[PDB]
Amino acid sequence: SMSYTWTGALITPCAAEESKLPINPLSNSLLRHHNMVYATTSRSASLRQKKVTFDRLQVLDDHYRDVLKEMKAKASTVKAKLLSIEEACKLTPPHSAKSKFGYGAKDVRNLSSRAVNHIRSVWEDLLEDTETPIDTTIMAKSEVFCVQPRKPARLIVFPDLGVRVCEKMALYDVVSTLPQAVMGSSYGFQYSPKQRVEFLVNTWKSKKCPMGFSYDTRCFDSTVTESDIRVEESIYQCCDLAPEARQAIRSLTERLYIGGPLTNSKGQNCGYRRCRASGVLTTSCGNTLTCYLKATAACRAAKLQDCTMLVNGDDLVVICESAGTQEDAAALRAFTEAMTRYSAPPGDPPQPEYDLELITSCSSNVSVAHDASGKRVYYLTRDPTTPLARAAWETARHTPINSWLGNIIMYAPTLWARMILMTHFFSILLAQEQLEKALDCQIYGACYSIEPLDLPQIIERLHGLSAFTLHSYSPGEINRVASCLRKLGVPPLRTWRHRARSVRAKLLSQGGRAATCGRYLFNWAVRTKLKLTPIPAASQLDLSGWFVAGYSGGDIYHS
Ligand SMILES: Cc1cc(NS(=O)(=O)c2cc(Cl)c(Cl)cc2Cl)no1
Ligand SMILES: Cc1cc(NS(=O)(=O)c2cc(Cl)c(Cl)cc2Cl)no1
């Protein structure tokens, strides 16, 4: 069937849309080529609609069925709990889209009678009506990028807030626990950046002759078929579940997940969806299961040897045993045809890699540096282009989500995050005296409230003390960074070193947590380094839950 059907009504915006980076003294200090940074808007919607609209091809074989049974057998060991309205309400982001039924996210979090009453009626409707399609709003997503030698906006589809709260009640525990139980070490969201690096490295070193490849599926969500969504549900149904939960999952699958009507911001019928909606609770879990299922079966079909997979939603990386140069290439080609038959056609043609560092997965790659003792240490890094473009943007325009805080946390050990992100943002937080003001950011799709002054401990817990002493980065990494800066008009690293010294000093002067930031975060700036010892409060942080599952588009907030 067609992934989408359009009536012709436009995908409209529900407010003005900013698309250019403002000329701002603060952002200009970070990146000068402001015309190279842009944000996607609804104006490019019709271009994305054209790319995601096509008839799907799907042929299932024995390998597929064998893998499905193996997964369901593992899903059988799970017992998921039904969440109370209260718990589900507490999981709602303070700035989540307001309902069209007289209440907003604040009301849901406060458990106001109106919100809670409407939520119950939605739940009860789910238990009674097993077929009426549920409404969804389709919007053009606003994302920031750097021009290329442009990207059309992504399309986000989501149901009303009442429904989103009901999804949590029935499936929050499921999508938070089942992936791991079914996929084991192959489930990516269970790892922190350091654990992910450890898994990829260990997996690589375990092969007699490693060969790896990332596999980019062409617009994954639109490739998910009705059969994929029912197969996915047949997996969830193996969990021990409360009666109402089992029914809510059954109704939600047929009324929301397999597809439904699309309505624009103006209230006009835009068309219909018969594929994965990006904004429902099961998108991340469902995509990871679907991708893992097809890929695992595809490997057997292609005769790839000892396939180890790491999956995060639609992002897939595979590490296996080489059978020779020509053999690997032929087998990779058969792998791709197998996925295509499963309705997971390729975007960028996959290529076999024999150098672990040359493999990009989840937009990142493993690289190497050295700690104080001179010992080698693997860490996760990426092309800083997008992070830098977004940092500039978030500096000139106040944004709800601060990707820079999240990039600092996730890429703390990198050359660019240390010399540029930490320096730029701490310098600004000092100038405006807002070092103690908590900010919102996202980790694996989940929204978190974080205080900048807690970065030292957080970084220590997630990456270890070595994140504050890495030096002697690799030539390729250093060159990718420098090259990136020249392209975007970002002052050269030498300049950032100089700015860092001034920042560090100011931080120490203030003492307290502020001084701790100067000591650990900017120890790389001074030539006469300090002895960095374990931070007290670090071994006490409750980082339980930060890396459990993916919640992209799941409207999740963790307090
Ligand atoms: C920050 C940030 C990004 C994020 N989610 S994500 O961009 O999908 C992501 C980031 C990283 Cl680093 C890895 Cl290894 C894997 C994933 Cl899937 N969560 O926090
Ligand atoms: C972090 C960090 C900084 C550092 N040394 S540094 O002198 O600041 C530095 C490193 C590199 Cl690689 C470049 Cl191109 C330029 C500079 Cl000025 N080592 O790790």
Side-chain angles (χ1 to χ4, degrees), residues 412-419 467-474 477-479 481-482 492-498 500 521 524-526 529:
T414 70
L415 180 60
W416 50 273
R418 299 172 74 196
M419 301 191 74
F468 312 121
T469 69
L470 293 200
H471 59 81
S472 218
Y473 291 81
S474 75
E477 173 67 358
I478 297 180
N479 289 304
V481 171
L493 297 174
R494 60 174 159 73
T495 301
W496 291 100
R497 170 156 188 79
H498 301 160
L521 301 189
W524 57 269
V526 291
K529 287 75 165 59

mmCIF file of all heavy atoms in Angstrom, residues 412-419 467-474 477-479 481-482 492-498 500 521 524-526 529, ligand 2:
data_model
loop_
_atom_site.group_PDB
_atom_site.id
_atom_site.type_symbol
_atom_site.label_atom_id
_atom_site.label_comp_id
_atom_site.label_asym_id
_atom_site.label_seq_id
_atom_site.Cartn_x
_atom_site.Cartn_y
_atom_site.Cartn_z
ATOM 1 N N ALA A 412 31.647 14.930 25.740
ATOM 2 C CA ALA A 412 32.575 15.588 26.664
ATOM 3 C C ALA A 412 34.056 15.321 26.410
ATOM 4 O O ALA A 412 34.880 16.216 26.553
ATOM 5 C CB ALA A 412 32.230 15.208 28.096
ATOM 6 N N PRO A 413 34.413 14.088 26.020
ATOM 7 C CA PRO A 413 35.825 13.770 25.771
ATOM 8 C C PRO A 413 36.428 14.296 24.469
ATOM 9 O O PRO A 413 37.647 14.239 24.293
ATOM 10 C CB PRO A 413 35.856 12.238 25.808
ATOM 11 C CG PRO A 413 34.585 11.862 26.552
ATOM 12 C CD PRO A 413 33.600 12.863 26.032
ATOM 13 N N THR A 414 35.592 14.801 23.565
ATOM 14 C CA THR A 414 36.082 15.280 22.281
ATOM 15 C C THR A 414 36.787 16.629 22.300
ATOM 16 O O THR A 414 36.513 17.494 23.128
ATOM 17 C CB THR A 414 34.957 15.368 21.228
ATOM 18 O OG1 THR A 414 34.069 16.439 21.569
ATOM 19 C CG2 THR A 414 34.174 14.054 21.167
ATOM 20 N N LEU A 415 37.697 16.778 21.348
ATOM 21 C CA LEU A 415 38.475 17.985 21.176
ATOM 22 C C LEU A 415 37.562 19.190 20.997
ATOM 23 O O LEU A 415 37.738 20.212 21.664
ATOM 24 C CB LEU A 415 39.368 17.842 19.946
ATOM 25 C CG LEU A 415 40.288 19.006 19.578
ATOM 26 C CD1 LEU A 415 41.263 19.287 20.730
ATOM 27 C CD2 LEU A 415 41.051 18.653 18.302
ATOM 28 N N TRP A 416 36.590 19.061 20.095
ATOM 29 C CA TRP A 416 35.672 20.152 19.815
ATOM 30 C C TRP A 416 34.719 20.518 20.935
ATOM 31 O O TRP A 416 34.461 21.697 21.156
ATOM 32 C CB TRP A 416 34.861 19.881 18.538
ATOM 33 C CG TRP A 416 34.196 18.547 18.470
ATOM 34 C CD1 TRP A 416 34.747 17.378 18.011
ATOM 35 C CD2 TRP A 416 32.839 18.244 18.815
ATOM 36 N NE1 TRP A 416 33.811 16.374 18.042
ATOM 37 C CE2 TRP A 416 32.633 16.877 18.535
ATOM 38 C CE3 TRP A 416 31.777 18.998 19.331
ATOM 39 C CZ2 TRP A 416 31.404 16.242 18.754
ATOM 40 C CZ3 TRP A 416 30.559 18.373 19.551
ATOM 41 C CH2 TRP A 416 30.382 17.005 19.262
ATOM 42 N N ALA A 417 34.182 19.527 21.636
ATOM 43 C CA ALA A 417 33.260 19.823 22.730
ATOM 44 C C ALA A 417 34.006 20.542 23.866
ATOM 45 O O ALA A 417 33.471 21.452 24.506
ATOM 46 C CB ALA A 417 32.632 18.534 23.247
ATOM 47 N N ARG A 418 35.246 20.140 24.104
ATOM 48 C CA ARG A 418 36.045 20.737 25.170
ATOM 49 C C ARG A 418 36.540 22.146 24.844
ATOM 50 O O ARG A 418 36.280 23.084 25.587
ATOM 51 C CB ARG A 418 37.231 19.819 25.505
ATOM 52 C CG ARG A 418 36.811 18.441 25.997
ATOM 53 C CD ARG A 418 38.007 17.503 26.134
ATOM 54 N NE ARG A 418 38.824 17.827 27.298
ATOM 55 C CZ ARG A 418 40.064 17.387 27.503
ATOM 56 N NH1 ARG A 418 40.659 16.596 26.619
ATOM 57 N NH2 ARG A 418 40.708 17.739 28.607
ATOM 58 N N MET A 419 37.224 22.299 23.716
ATOM 59 C CA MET A 419 37.763 23.597 23.332
ATOM 60 C C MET A 419 36.727 24.625 22.876
ATOM 61 O O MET A 419 36.888 25.817 23.136
ATOM 62 C CB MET A 419 38.809 23.424 22.232
ATOM 63 C CG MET A 419 39.978 22.541 22.627
ATOM 64 S SD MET A 419 41.324 22.613 21.430
ATOM 65 C CE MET A 419 42.031 24.257 21.795
ATOM 66 N N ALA A 467 38.112 12.084 30.742
ATOM 67 C CA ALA A 467 37.484 13.034 29.828
ATOM 68 C C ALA A 467 38.112 14.407 30.028
ATOM 69 O O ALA A 467 38.032 15.274 29.151
ATOM 70 C CB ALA A 467 35.973 13.113 30.077
ATOM 71 N N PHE A 468 38.743 14.583 31.189
ATOM 72 C CA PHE A 468 39.386 15.842 31.545
ATOM 73 C C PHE A 468 40.889 15.849 31.289
ATOM 74 O O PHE A 468 41.544 16.851 31.555
ATOM 75 C CB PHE A 468 39.139 16.165 33.020
ATOM 76 C CG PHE A 468 37.705 16.031 33.440
ATOM 77 C CD1 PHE A 468 37.350 15.153 34.455
ATOM 78 C CD2 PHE A 468 36.713 16.799 32.836
ATOM 79 C CE1 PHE A 468 36.032 15.040 34.868
ATOM 80 C CE2 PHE A 468 35.391 16.696 33.240
ATOM 81 C CZ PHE A 468 35.045 15.817 34.259
ATOM 82 N N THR A 469 41.437 14.747 30.775
ATOM 83 C CA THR A 469 42.875 14.689 30.503
ATOM 84 C C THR A 469 43.264 14.191 29.113
ATOM 85 O O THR A 469 44.451 14.074 28.818
ATOM 86 C CB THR A 469 43.608 13.800 31.528
ATOM 87 O OG1 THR A 469 43.237 12.431 31.325
ATOM 88 C CG2 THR A 469 43.247 14.216 32.953
ATOM 89 N N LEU A 470 42.288 13.883 28.261
ATOM 90 C CA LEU A 470 42.610 13.400 26.920
ATOM 91 C C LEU A 470 43.418 14.428 26.159
ATOM 92 O O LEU A 470 43.122 15.627 26.206
ATOM 93 C CB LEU A 470 41.346 13.075 26.119
ATOM 94 C CG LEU A 470 40.499 11.894 26.593
ATOM 95 C CD1 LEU A 470 39.606 11.403 25.449
ATOM 96 C CD2 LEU A 470 41.428 10.774 27.050
ATOM 97 N N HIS A 471 44.425 13.949 25.439
ATOM 98 C CA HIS A 471 45.308 14.800 24.650
ATOM 99 C C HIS A 471 45.874 13.923 23.553
ATOM 100 O O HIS A 471 45.688 12.711 23.572
ATOM 101 C CB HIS A 471 46.457 15.306 25.519
ATOM 102 C CG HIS A 471 47.287 14.204 26.099
ATOM 103 N ND1 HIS A 471 48.272 13.559 25.384
ATOM 104 C CD2 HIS A 471 47.232 13.587 27.306
ATOM 105 C CE1 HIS A 471 48.789 12.591 26.123
ATOM 106 N NE2 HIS A 471 48.174 12.587 27.293
ATOM 107 N N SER A 472 46.559 14.535 22.596
ATOM 108 C CA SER A 472 47.158 13.776 21.514
ATOM 109 C C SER A 472 46.090 13.060 20.679
ATOM 110 O O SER A 472 46.176 11.852 20.441
ATOM 111 C CB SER A 472 48.141 12.756 22.100
ATOM 112 O OG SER A 472 49.298 12.629 21.293
ATOM 113 N N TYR A 473 45.081 13.808 20.232
ATOM 114 C CA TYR A 473 44.020 13.224 19.424
ATOM 115 C C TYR A 473 44.592 12.747 18.087
ATOM 116 O O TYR A 473 45.725 13.087 17.727
ATOM 117 C CB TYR A 473 42.889 14.241 19.195
ATOM 118 C CG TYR A 473 42.083 14.590 20.441
ATOM 119 C CD1 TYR A 473 42.551 15.520 21.359
ATOM 120 C CD2 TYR A 473 40.856 13.986 20.693
ATOM 121 C CE1 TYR A 473 41.820 15.846 22.499
ATOM 122 C CE2 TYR A 473 40.109 14.298 21.829
ATOM 123 C CZ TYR A 473 40.600 15.232 22.730
ATOM 124 O OH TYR A 473 39.871 15.564 23.852
ATOM 125 N N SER A 474 43.808 11.963 17.352
ATOM 126 C CA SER A 474 44.251 11.429 16.066
ATOM 127 C C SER A 474 44.306 12.498 14.981
ATOM 128 O O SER A 474 43.544 13.466 14.997
ATOM 129 C CB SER A 474 43.322 10.295 15.606
ATOM 130 O OG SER A 474 42.079 10.802 15.137
ATOM 131 N N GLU A 477 40.945 13.068 13.110
ATOM 132 C CA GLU A 477 39.999 13.783 13.962
ATOM 133 C C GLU A 477 40.363 15.268 14.050
ATOM 134 O O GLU A 477 39.505 16.138 13.885
ATOM 135 C CB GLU A 477 39.968 13.152 15.360
ATOM 136 C CG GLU A 477 39.143 13.926 16.405
ATOM 137 C CD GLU A 477 37.636 13.937 16.137
ATOM 138 O OE1 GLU A 477 37.178 13.374 15.121
ATOM 139 O OE2 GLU A 477 36.904 14.523 16.962
ATOM 140 N N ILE A 478 41.633 15.562 14.299
ATOM 141 C CA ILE A 478 42.063 16.951 14.396
ATOM 142 C C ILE A 478 41.811 17.686 13.083
ATOM 143 O O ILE A 478 41.379 18.842 13.080
ATOM 144 C CB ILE A 478 43.564 17.055 14.759
ATOM 145 C CG1 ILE A 478 43.807 16.436 16.130
ATOM 146 C CG2 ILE A 478 44.009 18.518 14.785
ATOM 147 C CD1 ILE A 478 45.263 16.497 16.551
ATOM 148 N N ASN A 479 42.072 17.020 11.965
ATOM 149 C CA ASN A 479 41.859 17.641 10.665
ATOM 150 C C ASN A 479 40.379 17.836 10.346
ATOM 151 O O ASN A 479 39.999 18.847 9.747
ATOM 152 C CB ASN A 479 42.539 16.824 9.560
ATOM 153 C CG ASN A 479 44.059 16.935 9.612
ATOM 154 O OD1 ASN A 479 44.611 18.037 9.560
ATOM 155 N ND2 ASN A 479 44.742 15.794 9.718
ATOM 156 N N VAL A 481 38.061 18.417 12.487
ATOM 157 C CA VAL A 481 37.652 19.546 13.317
ATOM 158 C C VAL A 481 38.102 20.890 12.746
ATOM 159 O O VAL A 481 37.280 21.798 12.551
ATOM 160 C CB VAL A 481 38.201 19.427 14.760
ATOM 161 C CG1 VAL A 481 37.941 20.730 15.520
ATOM 162 C CG2 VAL A 481 37.527 18.257 15.489
ATOM 163 N N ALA A 482 39.402 21.016 12.477
ATOM 164 C CA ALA A 482 39.948 22.262 11.949
ATOM 165 C C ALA A 482 39.279 22.629 10.635
ATOM 166 O O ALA A 482 38.867 23.772 10.433
ATOM 167 C CB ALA A 482 41.465 22.142 11.756
ATOM 168 N N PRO A 492 39.774 29.595 14.832
ATOM 169 C CA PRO A 492 40.637 28.425 15.004
ATOM 170 C C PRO A 492 40.861 28.052 16.472
ATOM 171 O O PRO A 492 40.807 28.905 17.363
ATOM 172 C CB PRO A 492 41.920 28.832 14.274
ATOM 173 C CG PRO A 492 41.936 30.340 14.428
ATOM 174 C CD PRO A 492 40.493 30.700 14.168
ATOM 175 N N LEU A 493 41.112 26.768 16.709
ATOM 176 C CA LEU A 493 41.302 26.253 18.050
ATOM 177 C C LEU A 493 42.246 27.064 18.923
ATOM 178 O O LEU A 493 42.015 27.209 20.119
ATOM 179 C CB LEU A 493 41.766 24.800 17.979
ATOM 180 C CG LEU A 493 40.731 23.876 17.327
ATOM 181 C CD1 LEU A 493 41.335 22.489 17.168
ATOM 182 C CD2 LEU A 493 39.467 23.834 18.163
ATOM 183 N N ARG A 494 43.308 27.597 18.336
ATOM 184 C CA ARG A 494 44.249 28.387 19.113
ATOM 185 C C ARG A 494 43.492 29.513 19.804
ATOM 186 O O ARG A 494 43.747 29.833 20.968
ATOM 187 C CB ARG A 494 45.348 28.964 18.219
ATOM 188 C CG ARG A 494 44.900 29.880 17.087
ATOM 189 C CD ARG A 494 46.152 30.453 16.433
ATOM 190 N NE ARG A 494 45.948 30.933 15.074
ATOM 191 C CZ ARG A 494 45.301 32.050 14.760
ATOM 192 N NH1 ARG A 494 44.782 32.818 15.717
ATOM 193 N NH2 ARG A 494 45.187 32.402 13.481
ATOM 194 N N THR A 495 42.550 30.102 19.085
ATOM 195 C CA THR A 495 41.760 31.183 19.642
ATOM 196 C C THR A 495 40.931 30.718 20.826
ATOM 197 O O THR A 495 40.798 31.428 21.825
ATOM 198 C CB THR A 495 40.814 31.760 18.601
ATOM 199 O OG1 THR A 495 41.576 32.250 17.489
ATOM 200 C CG2 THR A 495 39.999 32.897 19.211
ATOM 201 N N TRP A 496 40.374 29.518 20.712
ATOM 202 C CA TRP A 496 39.560 28.980 21.782
ATOM 203 C C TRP A 496 40.381 28.641 23.018
ATOM 204 O O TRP A 496 39.876 28.708 24.140
ATOM 205 C CB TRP A 496 38.775 27.756 21.287
ATOM 206 C CG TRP A 496 37.695 28.124 20.293
ATOM 207 C CD1 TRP A 496 37.756 28.016 18.938
ATOM 208 C CD2 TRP A 496 36.420 28.723 20.594
ATOM 209 N NE1 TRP A 496 36.601 28.511 18.372
ATOM 210 C CE2 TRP A 496 35.764 28.950 19.366
ATOM 211 C CE3 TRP A 496 35.774 29.089 21.782
ATOM 212 C CZ2 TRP A 496 34.489 29.526 19.285
ATOM 213 C CZ3 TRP A 496 34.502 29.666 21.706
ATOM 214 C CH2 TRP A 496 33.875 29.877 20.460
ATOM 215 N N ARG A 497 41.647 28.286 22.816
ATOM 216 C CA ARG A 497 42.525 27.962 23.936
ATOM 217 C C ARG A 497 42.691 29.241 24.745
ATOM 218 O O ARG A 497 42.571 29.238 25.965
ATOM 219 C CB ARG A 497 43.888 27.464 23.432
ATOM 220 C CG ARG A 497 44.967 27.322 24.519
ATOM 221 C CD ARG A 497 46.075 26.303 24.147
ATOM 222 N NE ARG A 497 46.995 26.021 25.252
ATOM 223 C CZ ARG A 497 46.758 25.196 26.279
ATOM 224 N NH1 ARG A 497 45.599 24.536 26.387
ATOM 225 N NH2 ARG A 497 47.711 25.011 27.195
ATOM 226 N N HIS A 498 42.930 30.341 24.041
ATOM 227 C CA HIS A 498 43.104 31.635 24.683
ATOM 228 C C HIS A 498 41.843 32.064 25.420
ATOM 229 O O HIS A 498 41.923 32.591 26.531
ATOM 230 C CB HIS A 498 43.507 32.685 23.638
ATOM 231 C CG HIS A 498 44.779 32.351 22.922
ATOM 232 N ND1 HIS A 498 45.118 32.905 21.703
ATOM 233 C CD2 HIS A 498 45.789 31.506 23.242
ATOM 234 C CE1 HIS A 498 46.279 32.413 21.306
ATOM 235 N NE2 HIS A 498 46.708 31.561 22.223
ATOM 236 N N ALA A 500 39.628 30.086 26.615
ATOM 237 C CA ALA A 500 39.450 29.129 27.696
ATOM 238 C C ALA A 500 40.201 29.545 28.959
ATOM 239 O O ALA A 500 39.670 29.431 30.065
ATOM 240 C CB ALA A 500 39.900 27.747 27.242
ATOM 241 N N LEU A 521 36.823 20.894 33.900
ATOM 242 C CA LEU A 521 36.448 21.158 32.523
ATOM 243 C C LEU A 521 37.519 21.839 31.682
ATOM 244 O O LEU A 521 37.626 21.565 30.492
ATOM 245 C CB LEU A 521 35.169 21.998 32.476
ATOM 246 C CG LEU A 521 33.940 21.385 33.147
ATOM 247 C CD1 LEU A 521 32.710 22.227 32.837
ATOM 248 C CD2 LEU A 521 33.747 19.963 32.647
ATOM 249 N N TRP A 524 42.693 21.311 30.485
ATOM 250 C CA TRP A 524 43.444 21.189 29.234
ATOM 251 C C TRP A 524 44.030 22.525 28.781
ATOM 252 O O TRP A 524 45.012 22.563 28.047
ATOM 253 C CB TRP A 524 42.540 20.647 28.114
ATOM 254 C CG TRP A 524 41.304 21.498 27.872
ATOM 255 C CD1 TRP A 524 40.073 21.353 28.462
ATOM 256 C CD2 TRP A 524 41.205 22.646 27.022
ATOM 257 N NE1 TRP A 524 39.219 22.342 28.028
ATOM 258 C CE2 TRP A 524 39.891 23.148 27.144
ATOM 259 C CE3 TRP A 524 42.101 23.302 26.168
ATOM 260 C CZ2 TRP A 524 39.454 24.277 26.442
ATOM 261 C CZ3 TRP A 524 41.666 24.416 25.476
ATOM 262 C CH2 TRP A 524 40.356 24.894 25.617
ATOM 263 N N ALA A 525 43.419 23.616 29.224
ATOM 264 C CA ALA A 525 43.849 24.957 28.843
ATOM 265 C C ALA A 525 45.170 25.429 29.454
ATOM 266 O O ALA A 525 45.959 26.105 28.789
ATOM 267 C CB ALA A 525 42.740 25.959 29.171
ATOM 268 N N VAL A 526 45.409 25.084 30.717
ATOM 269 C CA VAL A 526 46.638 25.490 31.400
ATOM 270 C C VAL A 526 47.791 24.508 31.180
ATOM 271 O O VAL A 526 47.582 23.296 31.096
ATOM 272 C CB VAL A 526 46.394 25.641 32.908
ATOM 273 C CG1 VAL A 526 45.488 26.836 33.160
ATOM 274 C CG2 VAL A 526 45.761 24.368 33.462
ATOM 275 N N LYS A 529 49.054 21.777 34.578
ATOM 276 C CA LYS A 529 47.828 21.089 34.972
ATOM 277 C C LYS A 529 47.709 20.813 36.463
ATOM 278 O O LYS A 529 48.689 20.871 37.204
ATOM 279 C CB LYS A 529 47.688 19.758 34.221
ATOM 280 C CG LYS A 529 47.313 19.861 32.743
ATOM 281 C CD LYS A 529 48.481 20.307 31.882
ATOM 282 C CE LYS A 529 48.208 20.066 30.406
ATOM 283 N NZ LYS A 529 46.997 20.781 29.922
HETATM 284 C C1 LIG B 2 41.192 19.363 24.607
HETATM 285 C C2 LIG B 2 42.609 19.635 24.306
HETATM 286 C C3 LIG B 2 43.330 20.769 24.037
HETATM 287 C C4 LIG B 2 44.652 20.315 23.836
HETATM 288 N N1 LIG B 2 45.773 21.055 23.533
HETATM 289 S S1 LIG B 2 45.754 22.591 22.930
HETATM 290 O O1 LIG B 2 47.100 23.127 23.071
HETATM 291 O O2 LIG B 2 44.641 23.331 23.496
HETATM 292 C C5 LIG B 2 45.440 22.356 21.209
HETATM 293 C C6 LIG B 2 45.204 21.052 20.746
HETATM 294 C C7 LIG B 2 44.969 20.818 19.388
HETATM 295 CL CL1 LIG B 2 44.683 19.189 18.889
HETATM 296 C C8 LIG B 2 44.974 21.886 18.485
HETATM 297 CL CL2 LIG B 2 44.693 21.669 16.796
HETATM 298 C C9 LIG B 2 45.212 23.185 18.945
HETATM 299 C C10 LIG B 2 45.447 23.425 20.308
HETATM 300 CL CL3 LIG B 2 45.704 25.072 20.759
HETATM 301 N N2 LIG B 2 44.731 18.984 23.974
HETATM 302 O O3 LIG B 2 43.438 18.558 24.270
#
